[PDB]
Write a protein that binds this ligand. Structure first.
Ligand SMILES: *[C@@H]1O[C@H](CO)[C@@H](O)[C@H](O)[C@H]1NC(C)=O
Ligand SMILES: *[C@@H]1O[C@H](CO)[C@@H](O)[C@H](O)[C@H]1NC(C)=O
Ligand SMILES: *[C@@H]1O[C@H](CO)[C@@H](O)[C@H](O)[C@H]1NC(C)=O
Ligand SMILES: *[C@@H]1O[C@H](CO)[C@@H](O)[C@H](O)[C@H]1NC(C)=O
Ligand SMILES: *[C@@H]1O[C@H](CO)[C@@H](O)[C@H](O)[C@H]1NC(C)=O
Lengths: 228, 360, 358, 94
C-alpha cells in the first residue's frame, strides 16, 4: 500500500516486465489500468523493435540516385557542388538532367585546383570531375584521405578521340595509327607510365557511445539521489 | 453546379488593381463580368462540319460577349495567330506541389481482435465452470485470465489447477505466440514521395501511389499536350482532371494528391500562408503572361503604352511588395491517431472504474 | 539457292495501318504498301543497311509509316517525326506457409523436449535434495519459458534461482532466434548494372538472356556496354517467336525487348503468367517515330497531321482501343498459420478433456 | 534495450564473396574490397593487355606483394578477397 506518492515507479516498472508484484485491492480497480498500461507497453516495445528494424562508416553519396541531389530538404546538413564555368561538363550535365544544371548554376566555382583547395579547407562539399585524374591525384595526395566514391556506376563513362575537319583524307591514316597504338599495348604503356596511384558482429560501433551516454546519465542521477 | 445563380459581388486583387492602373493611366469606362465556366480554353472540335472552336474567355471574346481578357494568358502557337497580344506583364514559371508529411488497430482489420476477445471470454467461462466442477471466485478467475494475457507483472496468486494447469499453460504460450507473430509481421510489413522535375524515370510509368494531375482544359494542359514525348503523364493527368484549383488544393490537403503542376510564386505565397504546402527549389516554363487584345485599333496602342508605363516604374514592384513579399514512430502526425485511440481507451477505462466504484 | 520470287498479295491491319489510312484521309495520297524482304528493322554490316533503313536511305523508299526505333545512327542517316508514343525497353522473366510449428521445428523439437525433461529432473533433484516440484515441475518450467508473470513459490535455494536465470537467458536468446527466423521468412533485376546480368554466378541455378539480331537494340547496348553485347553473343537466340516458345517451355529465363509491346504480350497472356519486372521504370524509355528522307517536302504536312492526331484525343483513342487491359501489374495478414495453431489448440483442448475425465 | 538491439541485429543478420567477373561493384572496389596479386607477373601482363582491368590494376598496385607466400599469408589472415592464381595448386592446397 505504498502507492500514495510512489505511483510513478509502480506505473513505469510495468513496461520491462520484471518489477516486484504489488498486492492490488479486491475492488477490481488497479488491475484494469495495469492491463491497459501493459498493452500500451507491449505495443510501445513492438514499435521500438519496428524502429530498430527500420533503422537498418558508410558513404554519404551513393551516386546519381542519391536522396540528396534532388532536394536537400529531407536531410539536415546542406551541401554544395559545382563544375567548371562555361565548359563541356555543363553541357554534358544539360544533356542528361537540366535540373542538375539548375542546382549547379547557383553553386559554381572557379578553378579545379581552387576546388581542391576548397575541398581540403572546407569551402566546397562536392566537385564533379574525371575519375581517372581524381584517382591519380588521390594516389599522390598528402594526407591519404581521398577514396573515390563511385567510378562509373550510373555515371557517363565516356572516351576521348582525335577530331579532325569534315572531309580530311588523313583521318583514315590517323585511325590506322590508332589501331596500331591499341593493338600492341603502347597506349596502355603510356597510361601506366603517366597515370598511377597508391593507397558481422561489429555493427554496434556507435551503440557503445550511447551506452556511455546512458552510463553518464545514470551516474548523474545517482549523484543527484546521493546529494539529497 | 447551379442552374441560374449570378449575383453582383465585389472583385478585387491583382488583375483588378491592374485594370484600375490602366484606367488611371488612360481614361476608359468598363464593366467587369465573370466567365461562366472555370476553364482557360482549348481548341475543341464542334459537333458539325469539322470545325475547331474555343470556350470560356476566348469563346466570349470572339463571339462578342467580351472585349478584353484580363487574365494570365499563355502565349503559344494557337492563341497568337487568332487575336493580338500585348506586352507580357508577368514572368512566372511552373513547379510541383508535393506533401512532405501504422495500421495499429483502426486501419488494421478487426477480425482477429474480436476473435482474441471472444477466445479469452470462452477461456474465462470454461475455467470458471471447471472451478465449479472441481475434480470472489469469478473475480479471481477474471484476474487470472487477464493476468496471463497481461504479460507485464501483477500481484496475484495461483488458482487450483489440478486439471486446469494445461489449459493455462497452453493459453499463455498461445497469447505470447500471437503477440510475437503480430510484432514480427508488423516489423516485416513496415520494413519515397518526391518528384523533383518532369525528368524522372520513376514517373515514366506511374501507379496508384504516384498521383499527379493538373487543371482540366488549361493552358498548362495544352503545353503538356504539345509535349508529345510526355504521353504517359498526359494519360495520368487526363484521368484525374480537376475543374478548379481550389479543388486541387483541397485534394492535396486531404492527402488525395501527391504532386500538382502549378505556378511557382503562387505556391510560394501559399507556403507563406499555409505551412503544409512547401514545394522544391525548381523552376521551369518561364512564359510571359500578358493581356489578349483586340484587332487593329489605336486603343490597343494606348493599352500597350499603359502597360509600358507600368513596366518603366516600380508599380509591378509595388504589387510584388503588397502581394508576393508579404509573408507570414514519429509521434507527430503518424501516432496522432495512436494518441487519440489511447486517450479514448484511457477515458473509457476511467469511466468503467468510476462506475465500478459507484456501484459497489 | 536463287533470287526468284513471286508477288504474294496479303492483307494488312493493326495500329500503323490505321495511322496510314488516317494519313490517306488527311494528306490524301495513294498508298503503295509492300512488306520488306531484306530482313528486320536494321543493322549496318560493312556500310550495308537492311530492312526499312535499307529501303529509305538507299533511295528505294520514301517514308517509313510502320514502327521504327530511334537511336543516334538512325537520327544521323534520316530524320524522324515527333515521338507519338512512349515505348521504351523492358526485360521479360519466366514467372512460372502451412504453419510455424511442424515444418520449422521438427528435428529441434525432440531435443528441446529432452532438454525440458533434463531441466525438470534437475529441478526435482534440487527440490528433493534439501513446494510442488516433486512431479509437477512441467507447469512451472513451461511457465518460466514464456515468463507471463505466473507466481508459483518463494525460491529460497540459490541453485534453483541460478537454474531459473540460465533458463530465462536461454528463453530470451531462443525468442530472439525465433523472431529472427520470422523476420527472415518474409523483383529479381533492379537495374541495368545488376549483378546477375554481368555474371550468372550470383546464385546456384544458371540462366540465359538475349536480344534480337538485326536491330537497333544491339547498337543501343554497344553504345553503352560492349561486354553486355559479348554476353548476348555468348547467349544467342533465334527470333521473337522462338524466344516466346523458349519462355513458354522454360528454355529461356529473361529476354530484353520493348516496354509497351511486352506489356501487350503480358495482357494477352493466358493466365497472366509472363509478367515484366515492374513497368519499365529505370530503363532507357525511348520512343517511336516516322522516318523520311533528308529533304522531303512532305515531312511538314505529316508532322502537322500527327500533331492534329495527338492533340484531339484521337491518338489516345487509338492507343486505348488497340491495346489490352486484362492483365494488370503486381497482382501482415496470413490465413494458414494461425489455422494450424488453431488445430494444435484443438488438440490441446482434446488433451485437457482427456486429463479432465481421468 | 541492449537485448532488443541484439534482437534487431540478429534480424538484420538473417555469402563470402559476390564472385562477379564483370560486376561493376567488383570492378570498382572500395575500402573494404581488398584484393592483390604478385607484383610484375605475366598474369599482370595479361590484365594490362585488356581494357576493363584498369581499375583492378590501379587497386592491385596499392598492395604489390613480392612473392606468393606473402599472398598466402595475407589470404590466411582474412585480409584479401580475390587472388588470381592457378587451379591445380589450389586443388592441392584444399
Ligand atoms: C559564362 O559566359 C557568360 C557570357 O556568355 C558570362 O557572363 C558568365 O559570367 C560565364 N560564367 C558562367 C555562368 O559559366
Ligand atoms: C473619363 O471619361 C468619361 C466618359 O467616359 C468622362 O465622363 C470623364 O469626365 C473622364 N474623366 C476621368 C474620370 O478620367
Ligand atoms: C456537342 O454538343 C454537346 C451538347 O452539350 C456539347 O456539350 C459538346 O461540347 C459538343 N461537342 C463535343 C465536344 O462533343
Ligand atoms: C493613344 O491613342 C491616340 C489615338 O487615339 C494616339 O494619338 C496616342 O498617341 C496614344 N497614346 C496615348 C496618349 O496614350
Ligand atoms: C540478319 O539478316 C541477314 C540477312 O540480311 C541474315 O543472314 C542474318 O542471319 C541476320 N542476323 C542474324 C545474326 O540472325
Amino acid at each position: 500500500s505504498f502507492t500514495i506518492g510512489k505511483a510513478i515507479w509502480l506505473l513505469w516498472g510495468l513496461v520491462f516486465n520484471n518489477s516486484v508484484p504489488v498486492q492490488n485491492p479486491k475492488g477490481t480497480t488497479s488491475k484494469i489500468m495495469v492491463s491497459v498500461w501493459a498493452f500500451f507497453a507491449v505495443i510501445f516495445l513492438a514499435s521500438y523493435t519496428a524502429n530498430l528494424a527500420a533503422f537498418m562508416f558508410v558513404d554519404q553519396v551513393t551516386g546519381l540516385s542519391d536522396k540528396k541531389f534532388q532536394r536537400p530538404h529531407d536531410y539536415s546538413p546542406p551541401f554544395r557542388f559545382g563544375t567548371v564555368p562555361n565548359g563541356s561538363t555543363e553541357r554534358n550535365i544539360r544533356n542528361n538532367y537540366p535540373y542538375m544544371h539548375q542546382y549547379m548554376t547557383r553553386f559554381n566555382q572557379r578553378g579545379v585546383e581552387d576546388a581542391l583547395v576548397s575541398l581540403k579547407t572546407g569551402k566546397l562539399d562536392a566537385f564533379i570531375y574525371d575519375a581517372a585524374v581524381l584517382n591519380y591525384k588521390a594516389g599522390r595526395d598528402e594526407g591519404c584521405k581521398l577514396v573515390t566514391i563511385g567510378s562509373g556506376y550510373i555515371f557517363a563513362t565516356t572516351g576521348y578521340g582525335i577530331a579532325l575537319q569534315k572531309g580530311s583524307p588523313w583521318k583514315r591514316q590517323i585511325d590506322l595509327a590508332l589501331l596500331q597504338f591499341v593493338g600492341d599495348g603502347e597506349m596502355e604503356e603510356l597510361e601506366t607510365l603517366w597515370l598511377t596511384g597508391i593507397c558481422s558482429s561489429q555493427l554496434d560501433i556507435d551503440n557503445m557511445a550511447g551506452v556511455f551516454y546512458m552510463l553518464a546519465a545514470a551516474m548523474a542521477l545517482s549523484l543527484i539521489t546521493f546529494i539529497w | 453546379g447551379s442552374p441560374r445563380h449570378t449575383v453582383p459581388q465585389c472583385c478585387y486583387g491583382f488583375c483588378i488593381d491592374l485594370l484600375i492602373k490602366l484606367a488611371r493611366t488612360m481614361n476608359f469606362t468598363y464593366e467587369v463580368h465573370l466567365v461562366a465556366d472555370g476553364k482557360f480554353g482549348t481548341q475543341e472540335r464542334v459537333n458539325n462540319s469539322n470545325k475547331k472552336e474555343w470556350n470560356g474567355m476566348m469563346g466570349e471574346l470572339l463571339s462578342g460577349q467580351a472585349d478584353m481578357i484580363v487574365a494570365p494568358l499563355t502565349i503559344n502557337n494557337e492563341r497568337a495567330q487568332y487575336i493580338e497580344f500585348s506586352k507580357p506583364f508577368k514572368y512566372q514559371g511552373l513547379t510541383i506541389l508535393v506533401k512532405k508529411e501504422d495500421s495499429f488497430m483502426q486501419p488494421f482489420q478487426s477480425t482477429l481482435w474480436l476473435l482474441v476477445g471472444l477466445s479469452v471470454h470462452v477461456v474465462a467461462v470454461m475455467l470458471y465452470l471447471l472451478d465449479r466442477f472441481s475434480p470472489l471466485t469469478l473475480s479471481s478467475a477474471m484476474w487470472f485470465s487477464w493476468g496471463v494475457l497481461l504479460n507485464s507483472g501483477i500481484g496475484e496468486g495461483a488458482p487450483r489447477s489440478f486439471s486446469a494447469r494445461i489449459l493455462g499453460m497452453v493459453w499463455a504460450g498461445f497469447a505470447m505466440i500471437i503477440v510475437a507473430s503480430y510484432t514480427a509481421n508488423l516489423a516485416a510489413f513496415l520494413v519515397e514521395e518526391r518528384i523533383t522535375g518532369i525528368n524522372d524515370p520513376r514517373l515514366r510509368n506511374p501507379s496508384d501511389k504516384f498521383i499527379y494531375a493538373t487543371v482540366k482544359q488549361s493552358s498548362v494542359d495544352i503545353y503538356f499536350r504539345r509535349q508529345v514525348e510526355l504521353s504517359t503523364m498526359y494519360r495520368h493527368m487526363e484521368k484525374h482532371n480537376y475543374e478548379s484549383a481550389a479543388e486541387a488544393i483541397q485534394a492535396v490537403r486531404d492527402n488525395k494528391l501527391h504532386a500538382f503542376i502549378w505556378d511557382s510564386a503562387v505556391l510560394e505565397f501559399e507556403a507563406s500562408q499555409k505551412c503544409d504546402l512547401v514545394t522544391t527549389g525548381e523552376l521551369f516554363f518561364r512564359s510571359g503572361f500578358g493581356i489578349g487584345m483586340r484587332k487593329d485599333s489605336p486603343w490597343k496602342q494606348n493599352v500597350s503604352l499603359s502597360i509600358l508605363k507600368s513596366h518603366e516604374n516600380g508599380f509591378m514592384e509595388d504589387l510584388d511588395k503588397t502581394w508576393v513579399r508579404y509573408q507570414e514512430t514519429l509521434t507527430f502526425e503518424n501516432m496522432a491517431g495512436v494518441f487519440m485511440l489511447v486517450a479514448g481507451g484511457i477515458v473509457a477505462g476511467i469511466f468503467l472504474i468510476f462506475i465500478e466504484i459507484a456501484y459497489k | 539457292s536463287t533470287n526468284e520470287g513471286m508477288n504474294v498479295k496479303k492483307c494488312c491491319k493493326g495500329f500503323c495501318i490505321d495511322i496510314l489510312k488516317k494519313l490517306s484521309r488527311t494528306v490524301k495520297f495513294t498508298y503503295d504498301l509492300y512488306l520488306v524482304t531484306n530482313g528486320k528493322h536494321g543493322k549496318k554490316v560493312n556500310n550495308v543497311w537492311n530492312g526499312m533503313i535499307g529501303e529509305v536511305v538507299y533511295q528505294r523508299a520514301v517514308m517509313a509509316v510502320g514502327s521504327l526505333t530511334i537511336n543516334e545512327e538512325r537520327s544521323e542517316v534520316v530524320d524522324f517525326s515527333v515521338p507519338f508514343v512512349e515505348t521504351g525497353i523492358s526485360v521479360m522473366v519466366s514467372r512460372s506457409p502451412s504453419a510455424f510449428l511442424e515444418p520449422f521445428s521438427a528435428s529441434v523439437w525432440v531435443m528441446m523436449f529432452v532438454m525440458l525433461l533434463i531441466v525438470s529432473a534437475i529441478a526435482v533433484f534440487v527440490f528433493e535434495y534439501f513446494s510442488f516440484t516433486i512431479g509437477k515441475a512441467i507447469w512451472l518450467l513451461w511457465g518460466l519459458v514464456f515468463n507471463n508473470s505466473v507466481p508459483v513459490q518463494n525460491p529460497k535455494g540459490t541453485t534453483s534461482k541460478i537454474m531459473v536465470s540460465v533458463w530465462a537467458f536461454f528463453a530470451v536468446i531462443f525468442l530472439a532466434s525465433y523472431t529472427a527466423n520470422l523476420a527472415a521468412f518474409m523483383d529479381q533485376v533492379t537495374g541495368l548494372s545488376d549483378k546477375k546480368f554481368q555474371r550468372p554466378h550470383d546464385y546456384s541455378p544458371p540462366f540465359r538472356f538475349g536480344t534480337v539480331p538485326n536491330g537497333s537494340t544491339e547498337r543501343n547496348i554497344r553504345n553503352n556496354y560492349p561486354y553486355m553485347h559479348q554476353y548476348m553473343t555468348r547467349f544467342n537466340q533465334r527470333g521473337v517467336e522462338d524466344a516466346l516458345v523458349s519462355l513458354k517451355t522454360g528454355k529461356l529465363d529473361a529476354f530484353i525487348y520493348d516496354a509497351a509491346v511486352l506489356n501487350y504480350k503480358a495482357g494477352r497472356d493466358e493466365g497472366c503468367k509472363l509478367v515484366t519486372i515492374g513497368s519499365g521504370y529505370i530503363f532507357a524509355t525511348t520512343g517511336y517515330g516516322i522516318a523520311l528522307q533528308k529533304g522531303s517536302p512532305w515531312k511538314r504536312q505529316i508532322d502537322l497531321a500527327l500533331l492534329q492526331f495527338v492533340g484531339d484525343g484521337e491518338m489516345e483513342e487509338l492507343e486505348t482501343l488497340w491495346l489490352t487491359g486484362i492483365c494488370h501489374n503486381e497482382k501482415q495478414l496470413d490465413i494458414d498459420n494461425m489455422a494450424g495453431v488453431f488445430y494444435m489448440l484443438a488438440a490441446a483442448m482434446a488433451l485437457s478433456l482427456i486429463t479432465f475425465i481421468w
